[PDB]
Structure 1
Amino acid sequence: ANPGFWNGPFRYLRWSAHNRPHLFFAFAIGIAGPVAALTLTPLRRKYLYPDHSPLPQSYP
């Protein structure tokens, strides 16, 4: 049986996800976290501001 081998990355991700896949599908979640966290600044398109508060002491 064959492990993963780096030098062909399109091949590596294949024969990682097919022979020792159980860390692949973890790290797919690990890349779905922050990369999708960077594809939101257009995707919220200024959706909402939460607007919470402690006590509003006002001005003169």
Structure 2
Amino acid sequence: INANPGFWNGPFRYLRWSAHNRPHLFFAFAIGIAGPVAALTLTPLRRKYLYPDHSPLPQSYPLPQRAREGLTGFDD
């Protein structure tokens, strides 16, 4: 028989107890917590070292902000 110590009595001993005896819950939570913690702490390291961010794609016809200068050619 294996009893629950509780997370509060000993932290790392509870982590070891969950790893040996409830491996589906411990590893489900480990794969889940590896996501957003890495999304917080690993993306500025990538932008500083691996490659910077891509330029944005266009979505419609790109209008400039000008005032219709005259054009020559193809009158008739």
Aligning the two structures, in what range does the TM-score lie when normalised by the shorter sequence?
A: 0.5 to 0.7
- Structure having the larger proportion of residues in helix: 2
Contact 2:47 2:53 in 1 (8 A): no
Name the CA shift for 1:15/1:52 in 2 (closer, same or farther; >3 Å). closer
Distance 1:57 1:27 in 2: 39
Q: Which has the higher contact order (CA 8 A, sep 6+)?
A: 1
How far apart in 1 are the matches of 2:54 and 2:40?
A: 25
Name stretches of at least 5 consecutive residues in structure 2 with no aligned partner: 62-76
For these two proteins, the number of residue pairs brought into alignment is 59
TM superposition score normalised by structure 2: 0.51
CA RMSD of aligned residues (A): 4.2
Q: Distance in 1 between matches of 2:57 and 2:43?
A: 30
Cα 1:46–1:55 shift into 2, 3 Å? closer
Structure 1 stretches of at least 4 aligned residues deviating more than 3 Å after TM superposition: 1-6, 46-59
* Structure 1, unpaired ranges of 5+: none
- Structure 1 residues 46, 12: closer, same or farther in 2, change over 3 A? same
